[PDB]
């Protein structure tokens, strides 16, 4: 039921140090292939003031190159769908919690996305925004407790040129029984492809390929 192209909407809500904000996605991407493009707008809370990078993660597996021979734990979920925890612990004790509710209906996902952190210092790099970009990773995937999990070392690039670094993990959850993958790892570039002065308007793209 997954198609070779896919449309996506999307919606946030969360919470950043307190700021309350809410961001509605639109886009495309190819399952099979691992990518995927989103333009991502600021419907309240503008101007955010907290790092745009910090969210862009939140914004679906289905969109990853798996090789034929490694069952698909998210492209099998579907048309019922799956949904997503995520514990984002950073270098400076800034902490995030987000969740996904992914859903399909004909060649459209649907995400509704619940995002949460507090602790980021205000004079450290998320609520200065001195954030540039993620690095590409790799992330480790396997099975536990009947579902799929994944952890990742993640690092943000910063003005001036250090890095700030973030443990991801996340545990996926089909909504039906799937056929359980082995071990693998997914490798990851995601980047901000454009973006308006204070990321009120976003264009976001991910490439992702499992092996």
């Excluded at 198609?3 to 495309?28: D, S, T």
Aim: with cysteine; charged share 30%.
């Amino acid at each position: 039921v997954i198609k070779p192209e896919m449309k996506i909407k999307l919606r946030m809500e969360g919470a950043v140090n307190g700021h309350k904000f809410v961001i509605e996605g639109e886009g495309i991407g190819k399952p099979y292939e691992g990518t995927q493009t989103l333009d991502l707008t600021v419907e309240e809370g503008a101007p955010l003031p907290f790092s745009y990078d910090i969210l862009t993660p939140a914004f679906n597996r289905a969109f990853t190159k798996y090789p034929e021979d490694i069952p698909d734990y998210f492209k099998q979920a579907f048309p019922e769908g799956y949904s997503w925890e995520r514990s984002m612990t950073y270098e400076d004790q800034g902490i995030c919690i987000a969740t996904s509710d992914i859903t399909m209906e004909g060649d459209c996902f649907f995400y509704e996305i619940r995002f949460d952190g507090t602790n980021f210092p205000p004079n450290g790099p998320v609520m200065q925004k001195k954030t540039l970009k993620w690095e590409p990773s790799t992330e480790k995937m396997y099975v536990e407790d009947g579902v799929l999990k994944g952890d990742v070392e993640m690092a943000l690039l910063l003005e001036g040129g250090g890095h700030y670094r973030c443990d991801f993990k996340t545990t996926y959850k089909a909504k039906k029984d799937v056929r359980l993958p082995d071990a693998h790892e997914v490798d990851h570039r995601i980047e901000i492809l454009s973006h308006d002065k204070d990321y009120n308007k976003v264009r976001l793209y991910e490439h992702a390929e499992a092996r």
